[PDB]
Amino acid sequence: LQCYNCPNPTADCKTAVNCSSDFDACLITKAGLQVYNKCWKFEHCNFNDVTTRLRENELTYYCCKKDLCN
């Protein structure tokens, strides 16, 4: 379960890493332009529950749950 993402608001970075254990729902947030991509708890990709702790509102996040999914 890896993840093609970057910790801070990175528009030019999605290094591949692995952070699941209890959260393999790899969320990719796309707020305005900065994508808040981080790892997530499978049982939390409802609506804004993903970018809730990562700034929520009317974004367009895509959370995969299989592997880097990128």
> Which one of 1.10.3720.10, 1.20.1580.10, 2.10.60.10, 3.40.50.1000 gives the CATH number of domain 1-70?
2.10.60.10
Task: Please name the method used to determine this structure.
Answer: NMR
Question: What is the 3-state secondary structure of 36-68?
Answer: CEEEECHHHCCCCCCCCCCCCCCCCCEEECCCC
Cα angle 1, 21, 26; round to 5: 45
Q: Where are the domains of the chain?
A: 1-70
| Euclidean distance between CA atoms 58 and 18, whole angstroms | 27
| Euclidean distance between CA atoms 34 and 30, whole angstroms | 6
Structure tokens at 14: 């999605």
Pairing of strands 3-4, 16-17: antiparallel
Instruction: Choose among 38, 32, 31: nearest CA to 13.
Output: 38
| Residues 34 and 9: beta-carbon distance below 8 Å | yes
